[model samples]
Target: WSWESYLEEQKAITAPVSLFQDSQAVTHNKNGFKLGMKLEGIDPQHPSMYFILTVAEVCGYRLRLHFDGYSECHDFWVNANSPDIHPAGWFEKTGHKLQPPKGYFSWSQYLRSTRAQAAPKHLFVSQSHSPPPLGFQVGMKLEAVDRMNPSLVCVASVTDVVDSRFLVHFDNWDDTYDYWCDPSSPYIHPVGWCQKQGKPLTPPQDYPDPDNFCWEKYLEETGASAVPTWAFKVRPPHSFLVNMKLEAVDRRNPALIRVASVEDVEDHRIKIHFDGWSHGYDFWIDADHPDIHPAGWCSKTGHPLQPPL
Candidate 1:
């Protein structure tokens, strides 16, 4: 069934005018948090227990939080904007009890060093001051990514709009596969995005009106979609202190995060080398980039701590 039929059957309403939580309205942009970064969280299964976690996946405005050294059965979700999440050493700074893993002797004894580190502030997403009005009407055709087949871009249509989110219907897919996401999600795109990228765009299998994806005319009528894109700022030039630890995205495998340190600073960027890897694998990123975190960021976000190799 079409999204319209499905929604009608369920007597549901869509968010026609998207808005944001007051604090997130103005500065909202994608946070640089990646999978494998460590953090601390309240255990859902055992509410009284708190433990370290790892970032398993990232969706719009939320992180799929996972626990360290446990079965995947305990993984859960937390909003990116939630205060419950914090950087590493948060317990230390705030005087909360630090729970050691199944085999640690003392929380103190487990410390490879007393190095101070945290996820940087920018790794967490902030928003603009005002919410953008929803621009597309229901049934408006567009291009979207198939979440099951993320690499495959397909024809899609807007089915519903919720505050800060869009319910997208894949033209040829079944109801079970439909999804909701923020407009700025990398998976959603303007009608012509695929063509401009020189990539193959799969047309809908049963679309009734192939030529209706006239996005240019729609743009003229609606102005622009309120989706805020990323704005990058180069870090101010300064000396990067040595021996300062960080949560660094592994250069060999960008999906992985490791406790790393500043080997050196050059031009406007800093050299990041993971704890276990040799200096040969280290690379430089702009100091302001969100992928690099301060000492405690992983702890707050529920990412696992990686011991130095």
Candidate 2:
């Protein structure tokens, strides 16, 4: 399913940061910029001139800004905290000369007298809160703001959790855009943060509404552990050649270990085709998934392994 489908079900925009806004700022990250927000940015061609710009997107630590009345070709990226980008009236406060849009001469003072609407001060997240502790575990579903589409929140999961950061995988978009962020990122929020903000939220691309939509109840009922576990261990890379045999646990029968061969490779995933049960037992799994194992894993564990056909 497409991201739009995910949006239809979740009804919230996806975020890439944590629920705490202040934590985001302290990390040298910025997520408070809103689409349609106005700002002052230095012209790329004329470094000394400041122009009125619109926030096209909030990219982690950067903002995609477009000059007013200019073509998309004029759009450029600026660090959220860079001197190149500033709030309205920044030129006056900083004593930098402001320039009018391309068509107007500096003498016309077009923007100086009639600037576009600026993003409200409240729209920026308050970074005054203390850094919140990392509170995510792998497999928990949550709403996140998409870094590509800053205004659209989508369904995502904590796929991997490291020391103080976790990896987020978007519901339907894999292989790209998955990112890692700490607990205090502002893009991540409680499941219903959109409702409180009165913003439109999106749904998971293919899944049903999580029966436990309530974050607190969902975690409590599922017994989600905030305590870090050893499962977060980094998976080592493997060099499995074609036709190389391996031992894998039968998903349908976890107690049964089956002899399988590597048929193909894609990133961290490998295709496992059983030696005998090729018709239905073959499947793909991440190299790190515990279900797949080395050829001698069963023997090491005192378990019987199915013979190759």
Candidate 3:
């Protein structure tokens, strides 16, 4: 009915800075959440609760959040000065601490910015494996990524540790491997490359804790337990595995491998000990073996096992 009254109605709908008074005075602590600190924020449109959001392009007065509130590929631009949005811990003000997000376009996406420059995680069937310790002794034959072929392996000996992530090495046959790579590259895997294929894809979470969630919750919320039960098909004992995207072995080169045992496993890798070395790249055998992963191959593609199955 009135010009000023209509302006107020529009502000409630868009919450834009042009009409709303800037109420978010508590500047996000400079050291608080860096340039891209991802956390769940209220999806003003939808009603459930805070949905998953990613801290995508952040600039001077506004922060971008790629959201999955009601649909994937959604983007919300929030003014750093907008007091309506909340970070993960913001709920603590009302007795709630949001869980960290994980997976594609999720919380895990921001992990790169949070870490100081560092090496890969470990020696496993992944191009992203960590650099073997420079402290390696001669005669030590560890499972390593054969960089020449994205999924091949070459038997390398630790002759000497020259720098931060290198060791003087002699290749057994020099077939499909690369040399002189530091740990930054994800080119090698530790031995259990064959067996570690049975582990779970999600990082662990103990229950009762808010971080620990049930099957349905994980499929639809931003809890630390928002894990994908991607590896539930494979049975245990024969269960744990290293997640590697390995190339399949042709069963031709026999001198390219060594026998090792799995000790323990994490979300995408495992622990093992190798004594000798062999030749043909150690790769997947079963033609039907699901694509290689940190927790080995998937039992069946596109299927999730229960309690979520």
Task: Give all candidate RMSDs, comma-separated.
Answer: 19.9, 23.9, 26.5
lDDT of each: 0.55, 0.56, 0.33
User: Using TM-score as the measure, which candidate wins?
Assistant: 1
Q: What value of lDDT does candidate 3 attain over all alpha carbons?
A: 0.33
Give the better candidate number (1 or 2) by TM-score.
1
Candidate 2 structure quality by residue, lDDT tens digits, 79-183: 444434556665554445666665753322543566546755444332222333345756666667886677788766776543445666666665265666555
- Across residues 167-282, which tens digit of lDDT does each residue of candidate 1 receive? 57766666455765554445577677677998777766664565464446544654534222221122245455655555655646444556676778765567887756788887
Candidate numbers, best lDDT first, in rank order: 2, 1, 3
TM-score of each: 0.35, 0.31, 0.23
On the 0 to 100 scale, the lDDT of residue 38 in model 3 is 50
Task: Name model 2 segments beyond 4 Å from true.
Answer: 1-153, 157-238
lDDT (Cα, tens digit) per residue for candidate 3, span 89-193: 344444333434443333334445554221121211122123444434334443454433434443344433322333323243432232433333243333333
Give model 1's TM-score versus the native structure: 0.35
Better model by TM-score, 2 or 3? 2
Report the C-alpha displacement of residue 118, candidate 1, in angstroms. Answer: 31
Show the lowest summed lDDT stretch of 10 residues, model 3: 300-309
